[PDB]
């Protein structure tokens, strides 16, 4: 038994030819009452991987420290390979996964959804999924919370599968991400205007652009709904 | 089940999927979900499959009464008020998740209505379990007061978002266009994605491969003279 | 489901079914309700599948550590009462068990014990355990006599499972016949219950409710 | 759901949101909560969306008939019809309706009906579940009979805080004004006050 | 127990080329006890065939319920009822006891006498039309039946080719089903001639 | 109390029933209507005549639609037609549009309305 | 409330040949009514011409891939380059399964490979323990839809010889690696139209002592 | 439940009932009837809830006899079974559940043929050559299969039945202290004091 | 199925135990023991729920024997019931309650006078002239005060025991398939086939 | 209950209300919620009385041992002891804690800790049951880095609004001014705040 206390929701993500774009809302929901705003959940680990988490802030924060300590372990010894060949997204994914698996054994879970996404040092894009259940899959677009059935369908138009990735680029991806974040703000009660957009590109690395706003939202058809009387 | 309703300047366009489920088991590959209160007042339904069609049929009867009784064309409003009123009495135990659409002398319409008589008006509304998938696509391309033809391309593709990602939507995409002061045209099977491929070997069997315990002859004839 | 063993003059005949269902769906028809504890002892599979099969594989481990340690072949009483105290340790751990251990020794004779999940062990000469133990019982115990021949004993094992298969839902599939001797059990093979039906309808003249 | 109504010098200005969440899926977000149940007595809805709409038709029906046989009802009168329905359905429905109306004898008046069904005549009222977050702001910053401009921005600013803390409140801010001048619908786009 | 898992039952039906076929099993149980290897779950008024699945009591209860209503139609209007008109009838009737309902799955099959077309239709307990011109399967191994019937089926079948696909599909689901099997009977329904032929199968 | 539960239609001594003959007198002092059955349709036809010169007659439907495929027309009294056209429409919906969701046979429909007529010669009121 | 188990669906089919074996399954992974992935085998090679799928819940079903692949390694180490047999593989798994039975696994597990005589061997496990050999076994959320057809084309269930009319039963007919391709595709074609956990992709893995051959076929999108 | 057996022999019908009566956990009686003669050529036995059954059986014995004196000649066994089926269908829908599990054996003298029927409390009519209700059914439905042939006589049926009695006595945990045996045939309805 | 009986007379103890076993819905054995000798002239009869009876009887057989052979003194029936009572009391508090009621009848050698103890499944011993457990013993109690005297021989208490068993056939809703009688006499422990 | 803490230009002021209820019955009306766990870094209790008090001793116990070995803590450190203890006893115990302190380096700071064991720094924090009501007033009337006189009357007015709408709050208004200068205790009696 666990009860969700303070929860956060919605991270979206998609691949493109040279890298990934993962983006998230920032807002701490506490149910219908909203107690925190601008709560970051794009946690950068290394300098070419963002681990994008949703669900409980408490569980997120306790494994936020452990994620920084893996990098600390990697830098213990191996001066030639303290991130170069000791850090890739696939390692960071597995580390997270078996901690949630062992807590589902306990019955005392880490209540979260987790995206680990980045680009490997093989040079190939990475996008995998884990949660409090401790299921695991790879994907070509991926999402969490309310966007795992809202935003994610919009992105499946864009990239159908794992051979539509080179038909997708970063300008076409950028737009798709913008659109998706706007859409989440309309139909979810738990998504706000702030969102931070991180692109992990292989030619320019982790470019993390922070505090983007929703723009070109329509609310001008609102007057043409009338009363019932 | 992905069932959308997109309003446009000239009328309202209502589309539905033809995959019918019962559990994770597909009941029917192809069976349309569109019903008819009146010619100009169509609706489709998701939720309990028996409770949409009975509700539609019954309020179908009572507007048909009225339509003789006023000696004129009925209205979208008349269907909504009787629907809404009916469903409250039972307290939402007769399930119904209908996009109700139609045009009438008093302009273009497009409603959604839930089991206990909660009612919304929008410009694009969707209900069922595929409703989310549709809605994402539907909030991007749209703008106030579409064209006819734009509205038709966007509504089909909202169901297609459905077909791709909601497992309750599959197969054929039917469309029905209603436009003010003109006939309603049902463009069944507008978009048909996925068709079951030919068997690698056709399955035929020689006779006597199924063995008979006994034989008897019982015809469907009634009794008549010698 | 139905598993029976009856002592007679040549030893013990074990006859069991093989349709082991999941509920309204028949998971498999091929599931063998014989569990070879070693060459000289047999266990039926009744109760939960998993639990009953598993620990009688571990009983064979305890069979081979009897053989080694005592330099003798295990008593039936010894085998049975091992498995018994083990399931008492797990009593209210929710695991289910019902097996007839069949063995024939030169220092105890042919002996059946029906060991059960509760830590109950009963010595006995006939048991029938399962969903459809009642149906199989009726045929078997009417025509039961201690003096009996091997042919007659074999044919009565077939016919009893056949009756269970007819009326109860979870029985059927296939039969497996063993004839326990003191040199060990002799396998008398697998017969399908659906071919067995139509032989027995002709030969006895029975199954007169079936239209034919 | 956020609903308030506040009286001013020439009448009464009502103000509500336009988001309706059920759970975490927003059913409609351009939702019109401002409902005509007479000709000068409009209501604001909160609680369960169906149950309130059910009641307001039933009221619209009683009040329309009362106008033609007995004469115009008051704000008071309208509260007696919503009150007695909520009152015989308090164990089985729960409705928060705020009844505001413009008399021609005693200016605008505001009545609140909670979930058990009672009249309380008040110089402003606040109710709902997203505007249960602005209780302390509303009490403090109220001034007796403001000018018309001041009232609108007062109500807007309040519903802005209410929107800010509640994900169940939101969309445009819809406002209906009940006055001798007529019935005038105002609308505030989201950007125009989430900028502040 | 469940009212719908207490005596099993499946009805299969398929369409062919100028013919229909309906077929059922013969197993009538009260829970796990088999009572009889004989019981039709198929009935006929004129050239329309009603297979009714589910609950023991409700097979009889709905059967004389439609016995009454079929009478009224024939005596007034002096014709035997059509497959399509029967399907509508059944839809409305099932719906009458909405709460605490009829505990059955009827399956409607005929060949029209006004145009000479195959018609099939399906229903749940509450009842909703499940139109096809493929096959309608219902019951407890309805799930099993849906896969198996598809694998076999080809649009348009010669009346004794038709007979090969349905016999096989029904027997195989029914000998993996706990509450159903024990013999099977297939009707091949031609415009003017029905043969009722039993199948030898596993009675176990 | 009520006591008007005795019949207003009763037998005459030298046979027949007097009350239904009196009603038919209203038909042979009524307006005139006719019907020719073709092998490809039926035409039914009637006369309109005004109550005032400032009256309309396209506001009156002497031929009325019961269902898309079956129409009706009267001779006799107006008032009596107004109420009966509605009862026929209502019974065509309760009994074939809730039960078979289609339009009824014409033989059957005629029967059903004749029942309404028959039970209107029965009991008081 | 926290619920410690779920599902992820999928449908698998393991067929034993007469000198080959085929363990196949769909590559669609789902949770409820979201398609998680269109592409994702659970049909992993494990070494030593054994292919495993623990299908159903994905969290458990990855636990048994882990521990089993640990056992492959440690068998070679602790039995000094003695290869893990089909028989050996079956019983080891049983032990892993049985090992959590009071907090049981919720997958339907299958292995496949060839036996030592050079014929197929398919063992199939219930969720908590025991196994029995098969010749056809479907599992997954659409098990009971593909299973009764595979019995009518492999084992000739409820079929008789033509013109005998049930006097002579229909005997087995030795199968071809091609032939079994036709069976598997025609079944999962039916499966896509008649169940909703089926589509996107199918991957057949064919196993012999002559190699492991992969084949990816696309399916229908719903 | 109780012992309640049918065997339809090829010249008569033979029913059998439990003598015993147990209320709470104590036997009160051991010679008390559990069947009542409905019509002169129809017998009905009953078992279930053990207070419901007996009262309702009198409800059926009254209703079927009322029509038998009306037409001055009884209702045939098919017609009786049909009537019981109808009632029990209403009765499990009803607020007050009725559980009566009944075997109607009757010699149909209107086609000169024996008939036996098993109507469970759901209300399902079934024609059968031998029947049973409750747990007795579990041991006898097979046992009667082995030795029944279509040729049967009254004295062959008793001797097989006394075999079924004994088998149930060993195997079924409850006591019932033997059966009572009644025959329904073309010459009327008689009892046998051989148990 | 649950019937263990005790009649202590003035030279012996008379114990009876059920011969029937029922696990599940059926009788598995009609001929059985539910009683095990502990010492040469100490008999412990046992009954209750399945499988508590089997395991905890042999557990006690062991303990009591370990002592009486080692130190070559046969414990008083007084000492023995006390040991059995200590494990019975212990177990209700602990994780597994042992569901078993025991009549420990033994012949005191240190008092040359029989003793019969009744221990309820909670762990409370009480010495009595005669005793029972279960609901079946409720029937039998009312014969026991009537016919017992403080001058009874083995022969008297065997004839008293016939009435009590015959009472059980009538009044218990279930059988017990007769009883094994064992008479715990000064000479040894003997089994007789009287009922 | 209503507590709050707010940063300002020259430090941080912690504010609380010393009503402590059990049920309808107010158990004691002079039970402080302002708890010293470090001499310049104090904390604010809310939720169940027992649970927070008990944890506050544990956290005090390890900052005595911290200050004696490692020297003076920072506000960050006091809060992080709390955080990590309420994570390991979150399906067992419930807390509202606002931890606020004056450090020389970083001036006044406000952290708040829900019961799941999340820490979040904010410029202003509010907790209790009356926190919801005054939420709208707090962000409307707060100024970023205002003088001492404006901070005293802001927390006074905010807590006057809490006590008006939350009846589990009242007793008195107490405050701790943690500033560069030191610790100056305030109390404001009911007749003073009632007016203001």
Task: Walk me through this protein's architecture.
Chain A is an alpha+beta fold. In chain A, 28% of the residues lie in helices and 30% in strands. In chain A, the strands form three sheets. In chain A, strands 1, 6, 7, 8, 9 and 10 form a six-stranded antiparallel β-sheet that branches. A five-stranded antiparallel β-sheet of chain A has the order 11-2-3-12-13, covered by helices on one side. A two-stranded antiparallel ribbon of chain A has the order 4-5. In chain A, a hairpin with a 3-residue loop joins strand 12 (195-201) and strand 13 (205-212). In chain A, helix 3 (151-158) packs antiparallel against helix 4 (170-187). The radius of gyration of chain A is 18 Å and the shape is globular. Chain C is α+β, with helices and mostly antiparallel strands and 212 residues long. Chain C has one domain (1-212): 4-Layer Sandwich (Glutamine Phosphoribosylpyrophosphate, subunit 1, domain 1), CATH 3.60.20. Chain C has helices at 49-70, 76-89, 133-142, 150-167, 193-204, and strands spanning 2-8, 11-16, 34-38, 41-44, 98-105, 109-116, 120-124, 126-130, 174-180, 185-192. In chain C, strands 8-1-2-9-10 form a five-stranded antiparallel β-sheet. Chain G contains four helices and twelve strands, in the order E-E-E-E-E-E-H-H-E-E-E-E-H-H-E-E. Chain G is an alpha+beta fold. Chain G has helices at residues 58-78, 86-98, 143-153, 177-194, and strands at residues 11-16, 21-26, 29-31, 34-37, 44-47, 50-56, 107-114, 120-125, 131-134, 136-140, 201-208, 211-218. Helix content of chain G is 28%, strand content 31%. Chain H contains five helices and eleven strands. In chain H, the strands form three sheets. A five-stranded antiparallel β-sheet of chain H has the order 9-1-2-10-11. A four-stranded antiparallel β-sheet of chain H has the order 5-6-7-8, covered by helices on one side. In chain H, strands 3-4 form a two-stranded antiparallel sheet. The interface between C and I is medium-sized, with 18 and 14 residues. Strand 13 (215-216) of chain B pairs antiparallel with strand 11 of chain E.
């Amino acid at each position: 038994t666990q009860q969700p206390i303070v929860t956060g929701t919605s991270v979206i993500s998609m691949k493109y030819d040279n890298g990934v774009i993962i983006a998230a809302d920032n807002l701490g929901s506490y149910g219908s009452l909203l107690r925190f705003n601008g709560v970051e959940r794009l946690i950068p680990v290394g300098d070419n991987t963002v681990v994008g988490i949703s669900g409980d802030i408490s569980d997120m924060q306790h494994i936020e420290r452990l994620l920084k300590d893996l990098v600390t372990e990697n830098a213990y010894d191996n001066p030639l390979a303290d991130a170069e060949e000791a850090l890739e997204p696939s390692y960071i994914f597995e580390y997270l996964a078996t901690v949630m698996y062992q807590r589902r054994s306990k019955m005392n879970p880490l209540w979260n959804a987790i995206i680990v996404a980045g680009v490997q040092s093989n040079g190939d894009q990475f996008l995998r999924y884990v949660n409090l259940l401790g299921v695991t899959y790879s994907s070509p677009t991926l999402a969490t919370g309310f966007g795992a059935h809202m935003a994610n369908p919009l992105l499946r138009k864009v990239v159908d599968r794992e051979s539509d990735i080179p038909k997708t680029t970063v300008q076409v991806a950028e737009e798709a991400i913008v659109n998706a974040m706007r859409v989440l703000y309309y139909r979810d009660a738990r998504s706000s205007r702030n969102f931070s957009l991180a692109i992990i590109d292989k030619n320019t690395g982790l470019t993390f652009k922070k505090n983007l706003q929703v723009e070109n939202m329509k609310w001008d058809f609102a007057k043409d709904i009338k009363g019932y009387g | 089940t992905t069932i959308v309703g997109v309003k446009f300047n000239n009328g309202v366009v209502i589309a539905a999927d033809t995959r019918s489920t019962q559990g994770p088991i597909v009941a029917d590959k192809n069976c349309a979900k569109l019903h008819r209160i009146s010619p100009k007042i169509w609706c489709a339904g998701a939720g309990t499959a028996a409770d949409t069609e009975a509700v539609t049929q019954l309020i179908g009867s009572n507007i048909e009464l009225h339509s003789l009784y006023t000696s004129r064309e009925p209205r979208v409003v008349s269907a909504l008020q009787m629907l809404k009123q009916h469903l409250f009495k039972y307290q939402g135990h007769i399930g119904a998740y209908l996009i109700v659409a139609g045009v009438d002398p008093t302009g273009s319409h497009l409603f959604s209505i839930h089991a206990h008589g909660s009612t919304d008006v929008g410009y694009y509304l969707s209900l069922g379990s595929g409703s989310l998938a549709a809605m994402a696509v539907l909030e991007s391309h749209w703008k106030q007061d579409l064209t006819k033809e734009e509205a038709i391309k966007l509504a089909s593709d909202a169901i297609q978002a459905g077909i791709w990602n909601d497992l309750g939507s599959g197969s054929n995409v039917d469309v029905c266009v209603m436009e003010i002061g003109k006939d309603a045209e049902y463009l069944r099977n507008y978009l048909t994605p996925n068709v079951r491929e030919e068997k690698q070997k056709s399955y035929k069997f020689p006779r006597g491969t199924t063995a008979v315990l006994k034989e008897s002859i019982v015809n469907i004839c009634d009794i008549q003279e010698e | 489901t139905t598993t029976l063993a009856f002592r007679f003059q040549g030893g013990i005949i074990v006859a069991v079914d093989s349709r082991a269902t999941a509920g309204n769906w028949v998971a498999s028809q091929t599931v063998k309700k014989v569990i070879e504890i070693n060459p000289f002892l047999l266990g039926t599979m009744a109760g939960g599948a998993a639990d009953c099969q598993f620990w009688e594989t571990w009983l064979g481990s305890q069979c081979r550590l009897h053989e080694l340690r005592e330099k003798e072949r295990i008593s039936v009483a010894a085998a049975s009462k091992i498995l018994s105290n083990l399931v008492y340790q797990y009593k209210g751990a929710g695991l289910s068990m019902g097996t007839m251990i069949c063995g024939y020794t030169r220092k105890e004779g042919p002996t059946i014990y029906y060991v059960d999940s509760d830590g109950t062990r009963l010595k006995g000469d006939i048991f029938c355990v399962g969903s459809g133990q009642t149906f199989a019982y009726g045929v078997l115990d009417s025509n039961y006599k201690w003096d009996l021949s091997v042919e007659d004993a074999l044919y009565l094992g077939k016919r009893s499972i056949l009756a269970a298969a007819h009326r109860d839902a979870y029985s059927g599939g296939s039969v497996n016949l063993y004839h326990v001797t003191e040199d060990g059990w002799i396998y008398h093979g697998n017969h399908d219950v659906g071919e067995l039906f139509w032989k027995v309808k002709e030969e006895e003249g029975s199954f007169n409710n079936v239209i034919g | 759901t956020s609903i308030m109504a506040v009286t001013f010098k020439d009448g009464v200005i009502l103000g509500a949101d336009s988001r309706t969440t059920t759970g975490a899926y927003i059913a409609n977000r351009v939702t019109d909560k401002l409902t005509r149940v007479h000709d000068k007595i409009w209501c604001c809805r909160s609680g369960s969306a169906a149950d309130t709409q059910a009641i307001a038709d039933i009221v619209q029906y009683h009040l329309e008939l009362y106008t033609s046989q007995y004469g115009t009802p008051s704000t008071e009168t309208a509260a007696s019809v919503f009150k007695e329905l909520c009152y015989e359905n308090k164990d089985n429905l729960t409705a928060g309706i705020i009844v505001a109306g413009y008399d021609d004898k005693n200016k605008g008046e505001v009545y609140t009906i909670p979930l058990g069904g009672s009249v309380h005549k008040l110089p402003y009222a606040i109710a709902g579940s997203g505007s249960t977050f602005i209780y302390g702001y509303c009490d403090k910053n109220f001034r007796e009979n403001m000018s018309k401009e001041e009232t609108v921005d007062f109500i807007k600013h309040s519903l802005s805080q209410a929107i800010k803390w509640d994900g169940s409140s939101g969309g445009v801010i819809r406002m209906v004004v009940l006055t001798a001048a007529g019935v005038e619908r105002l609308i505030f786009y989201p950007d125009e006050y989430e900028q502040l | 127990s469940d009212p719908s898992s207490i005596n099993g039952g499946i009805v299969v039906a398929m369409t062919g080329k100028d013919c229909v076929a309906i077929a059922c099993d013969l197993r009538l149980g009260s829970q796990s006890l088999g009572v009889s290897n004989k019981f039709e779950k198929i009935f006929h008024y004129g050239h329309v065939f009603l297979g009714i699945t589910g609950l023991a009591t409700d097979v009889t209860t709905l059967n004389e319920m439609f016995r009454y209503k079929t009478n009224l139609y024939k005596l007034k209007e002096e014709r035997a009822i059509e497959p399509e008109t029967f399907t509508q009838l059944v839809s409305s009737s099932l719906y009458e006891r909405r709460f605490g309902p009829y505990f059955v799955g009827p399956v409607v099959a005929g060949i029209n006498s006004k145009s000479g077309k195959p018609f099939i239709a399906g229903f749940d307990l509450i009842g909703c039309i499940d139109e096809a011109k493929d096959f309608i399967v219902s019951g407890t191994a309805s799930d099993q039946l849906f896969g198996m019937c598809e694998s076999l089926y080809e649009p348009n079948l010669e009346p004794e080719d038709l007979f090969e696909t349905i016999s096989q599909a029904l027997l195989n689901a029914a000998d993996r089903d706990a509450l159903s099997g024990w013999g099977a009977v297939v009707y091949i329904i031609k415009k003017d001639e029905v043969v009722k032929r039993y199948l030898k199968m596993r009675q176990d | 109390t009520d006591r008007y539960s005795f019949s207003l239609t009763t037998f005459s001594p030298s046979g027949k029933l007097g009350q239904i003959d009196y009603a038919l007198t209203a038909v042979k002092q009524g307006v005139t209507s006719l019907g020719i059955k073709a092998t490809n349709g039926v035409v039914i036809a009637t006369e309109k005549k005004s109550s005032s010169p400032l009256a309309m007659s396209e506001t009156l439907s002497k031929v009325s639609l019961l269902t898309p495929d079956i129409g009706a027309v009267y001779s006799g009294m107006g008032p009596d037609y107004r109420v009966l056209v509605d009862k026929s429409r209502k019974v065509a919906h309760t009994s074939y549009k809730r039960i078979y969701g289609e339009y009824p046979p014409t033989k059957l429909l005629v029967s059903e309305v004749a029942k309404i007529m028959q039970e209107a010669t029965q009991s008081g009121g | 409330q926290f619920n410690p188990y779920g599902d992820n669906g999928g449908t698998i089919l393991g067929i034993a040949g007469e000198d080959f074996a085929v363990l196949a399954g769909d590559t669609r992974n789902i949770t409820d009514y979201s398609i998680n992935s269109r592409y994702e085998p659970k049909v992993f090679d494990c070494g030593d011409n054994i292919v495993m799928s623990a299908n159903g819940f994905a969290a458990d079903g990855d636990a048994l891939v882990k521990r089993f692949k640990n056992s492959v390694k440690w068998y070679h180490f602790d039995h000094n380059d003695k290869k893990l047999s089909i028989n050996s593989a079956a019983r080891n798994i049983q032990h892993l399964l049985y090992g959590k039975r009071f907090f049981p696994y919720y997958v339907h597990t299958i292995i496949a490979g060839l036996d030592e005589d050079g014929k197929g061997a398919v063992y199939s496990f219930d969720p908590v323990g025991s196994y029995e050999r098969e010749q056809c076994r479907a599992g997954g959320a659409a098990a009971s839809l593909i299973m009764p057809f595979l019995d009518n084309q492999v084992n000739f269930k409820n079929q008789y010889e033509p013109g005998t009319n049930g006097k002579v039963k229909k005997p087995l007919k030795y199968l071809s690696v091609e032939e079994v391709i036709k069976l598997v595709r025609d079944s999962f074609t039916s499966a896509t139209e008649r169940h909703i956990q089926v589509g996107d992709g199918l991957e057949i893995l064919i196993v012999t002592k002559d190699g492991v051959r992969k084949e990816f076929y696309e399916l229908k999108r719903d | 439940m109780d012992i309640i057996l049918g065997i339809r022999v090829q010249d008569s019908v033979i029913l059998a009932s439990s003598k015993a009566v147990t209320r709470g956990i104590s036997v009160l009686k051991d010679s008390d009837d559990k069947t009542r003669q409905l019509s002169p050529h129809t017998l009905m036995s009953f078992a279930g809830e053990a207070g419901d059954t007996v009262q309702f059986a009198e409800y059926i014995q009254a209703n079927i006899q009322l029509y038998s004196i009306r037409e001055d000649y009884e209702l045939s066994p098919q017609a009786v079974s049909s009537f019981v089926r109808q009632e029990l269908a209403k009765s499990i829908r009803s607020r007050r559940p009725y559980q009566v599990n009944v075997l109607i054996g009757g010699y149909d003298k209107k086609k000169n043929k024996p008939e036996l029927y098993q109507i469970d409390y759901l209300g399902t009519k079934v024609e059968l050559p031998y029947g049973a209700h409750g747990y007795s059914g579990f041991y006898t439905f097979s046992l009667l299969d082995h030795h029944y042939r279509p040729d049967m006589t009254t004295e062959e049926g008793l001797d097989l039945l006394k075999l079924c009695v004994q088998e149930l006595e060993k195997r079924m945990p409850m006591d019932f202290k033997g059966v009572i045996v009644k025959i329904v045939d073309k010459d009327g309805i008689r009892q046998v004091d051989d148990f």
